[PDB]
């Protein structure tokens, strides 16, 4: 039996090969079982060689320590400490004359482990049939979960016992453009859990590279989660060549929910930055967009309503009749540029700028876009000239309609077109079933594609925000030009019937573990019927809570998603969106309970200014704030953006108060969050 | 109810919708049934009745028109091709699904082409083909010259059998290959060649295979009906379609004279006209040698080093590896090939194994297998370019993909730019192994898109393409004449892997060569492979004279002399035919042809009065009584006959040949005997302009 302890001594891992030769581990935190005895291993595709899960012998083992500090290009703080004790075990399989290494890294806030496959005579090329990584639970915990799916993460969270997942799964799987649920007890990572004995446990992975995306399948009789990888077109779960490594599997654990949010285990298990000049060109982006028009149905992506279908290079759009709904027209874009410039925004996104949108949805169309040819009413050169004159950058849009070979064929030309026309950031998308047909969004094949697009973008000094991509696993450390994904249910679904009131009190515990989200907050007119009378969707938020998301939904990429006209009605509240920073020297998690409330204070990078947000669930929240994180002796202008006493997400969402006063490190504030409400505070040094 | 006749009146097509509403056609030739009543149509993938595009049709309208125009190939068997047909177009309406299709029939003096057309309409836009149900109902139990139906290889020896015997012979006919997916006990590939008991020759094939899955044939051996069997994708579907769109043409070439099957240009005539405006200014035939046979025979390696199990490109440091002393693609060795090419008037030298990755290329389903850009330490790209240019030689680029197709596409613009930057204007590509993306086949719609994408992009760089393991050609060279080659059949390489059947080159022109030329790589003089590699006991099933014959009987604008220079140096008298023979022709005459037995062809070298003749013979040899009526009255010629010696034989005495020079004219007569697996070659050079 091998033993490993955290630097602070509070976590203990034990490892042994069991009587069947199965590698086994367990984990305790302050004397409480976190992971019961759990087996590790893989089954390989047949060409006893299929068995890489038992008949192992422990040949050697070592423990080492590591302690270094590094600086993110952008992040929640200036400096991250990477401190762990490491156990490496060398496991030999006599029957197959081959060895693997299992590497365990134990931090004060949890455990990472991975498989390593050394180059040897009897292990070179192999295909994974299944990974059999176990996470044996000590009880029937509360879980905050979305359905296990190879193609979408755009689901509302369910809060239930592990025993209740099976019964709730059918109702949890709501309609989506591309979805492949795999099990009645299948869930996605990161999975958040709360134990009856007062522990918070997060199960996830780190550095998902050259490998298939991991989901979890629950054995709900023994309460064991098992790794369930995403299959390819032939049902296989990864083409490997030694030397190679699995991604890390992570268990983040604390008796304080705030320490789950504070964990940097995911980033710490990724390889250091591989972009030498990163600081010189990678910058956070605050943006508005020609976007909400089309999401609500007020406007169209399409130029014309005249065409049943289109053939790019044959269809002559100059001979088609404008539908009068096409939001991506030069005059309209210039009005967005004016509003962006007046209010200190960095960029304007425009969607529907390019030929093809008439056919974009659900046709499995190969040649669906060229990412190069503007519609007749979108003047790329004039918009570039005008934006540049107002100190604004345009954000490029590359919806692929999940036609991935087509995107790859155009990708160098599309990136060159961006550079030639003054675009340095792109929002990509993968809406529809993947082409090549038979592949899923999160398979090894597509994971390669998403990273290929990011690596190539880095060579062009382009920042990437990829919607519908595999959810992040901390690769932003290695490639910091990946400034965003959606890869979860965003504000767009507030237009498609609504998100659960508690949604933004769960995402920071689940989706945000591994990288930021382009959540597109800032909807002030929460009734979608004001954009489109046929749309009766209502945003499950107060205005004050929308302001809070600029602090509680961390991202270097922040949209103000509403139309300028709606911001002009509430410019007093809009001041918080104008003021709030995108990048931070320090973050303090003041209050956190998944599904109930999140309160975060952040120090704007290079300043002594602080920003606070609180987001609350179905029953609201009461905060008793203290400000001992402020500098002794310094006075601050505090602006509190709060729910009015009669505010409510459903009955009275636009009821807010704004109060300015002098604050210091001795100040105390008691604040009430409405149901689906919250508050925002700017704290600017005098 | 609808009738169409050939321009000359010898062929009659009838079309009617049968009682089930199934479109039906038949074909007669000089009063003989060629195609019995045969149904047409498709089954579509379910999103009940909408899946049915095979019956419940009504004949809505029809017209007959005539067409007669002549066009000039960039390269070909003749200067001019006549495109003359009568056309029947039928509009077929399906009331139950409120949609129409068009079936278009083109009837020539030498056979029939038909295709489906899917017009843009309210009720037909995006659809997926489950199966095509194009029937070819045979009049009898014909002799067929066939290879196994397969989604991934055509590298099979031919079988000659009755249609009734195909089922019993299929298992024996499927030999081991790097990538193969046979689909049916009675599945065969196209072009399929047949000989009837009532004196007819019938060829079944397709033309203009674009944005569609490759067609094979599946035999109903109880009713003797062949049916279209398309290549499935990774999900088992057989084509993603968007109206307006067309199927490829399906062709029935028929004559009572086997020579008229070879003479048919129906395949080329059914392709769209040339889309490369400046084609003549840069597309040129290529005669080449190669650093190649060394590696095929096992004498040399593609690999730089023997020290590595596997490689990681960009990590593996080849400057730290030991040269294996067998690596043929080294600067000094390549320069010696350039010297031989330059001295003997060849256009190009192919080099394989020039680039990092060959230590770890074969049958691993490896994604990042090659970069098409980084030379081995012993191959100086820049020095070889300078040296080749100084000797008036072009280097032919090699892009083996190891069937890793996304990887090739990601590199393709950079790889073509690298070619242009370093003076390469032609590329031999390859797709050895199971396709990546995994689940796709070599001949599916997905890969057909890839191969044509590679050709279209090459055209923009003024690059000519020779693609091994690609879908077999269907006349697209008319549209994109920079496609100067495919293998896409069993080539000379298999003469190193145990041998080709003696009769192989008497069948390929009736089958594989219908739709475009083959890079067959003829010209092996040292037919015992154990002289290259003692461990290799394979023998080429040929005499030397028959190897010379293939430069005329295996038509291609791309011709390799495949042997090593030192082997040619031992038989330079015979090598003179390979030096002299043209690559491009103003006229071709098929003098003698019987599939599986013998082919004799005369060709007039483009822009000249010079003629070249080849005869290739099967297991029993052949006797020719040649006449020369095709020569110009009054003109005298120097004829050089390269023939089998009296005691020549492919197995027992393959290197026994004679060379006889004499004066020839249009009244000359020559009686020649081809040995078993033998043949002959004749250069006929007009006396005044002789060189
Ligand atoms: C625009 C949106 O379309 C799809 O959303 C559908 C929902 O999945 C369904 O539940 C149902 O309500 O209909 C919705 C509309 O068809 C798709 O699934 C989403 O992922 C998609 N969102 C992306 C598409 C865009 C266009 O390029 C972007 O504007 C947007 O920001 C993307 O996130
Ligand atoms: C080189 C050759 O390899 C494969 O051939 C195998 C045969 O299929 C088997 O029957 C058995 O005998 O082993 C042979 C060697 O492994 C493959 O199937 C062929 O298609 C392949 N030929 C191409 C490969 C090349 C390398 O790029 C070229 O040199 C050659 O011209 C290609 O045609
Ligand atoms: Ca989306
Ligand atoms: Ca081959
Ligand atoms: Na309240
Ligand atoms: Na004889």
Residue numbers in the entry:
A (entry chain A): 22 to 68, 88 to 726
B (entry chain B): 22 to 68, 87 to 730
What did the publication describing this PDB structure actually write?
Acarbose is a type 2 diabetes medicine that prevents dietary starch breakdown into glucose by inhibiting host amylase and glucosidase enzymes. Species in this phylum normally deploy a well-characterized Starch utilization system (Sus) to recognize, degrade, and import starch. Maltooligosaccharides are transported to the periplasm by a predicted TonB-dependent transporter, SusC, where they are degraded to glucose by a neo-pullulanase/α-amylase, SusA, and an α-glucosidase/glucoamylase, SusB. Instead, we discovered that although acarbose primarily targets the Sus periplasmic GH97 enzymes in both organisms, the drug affects starch processing at multiple other points.
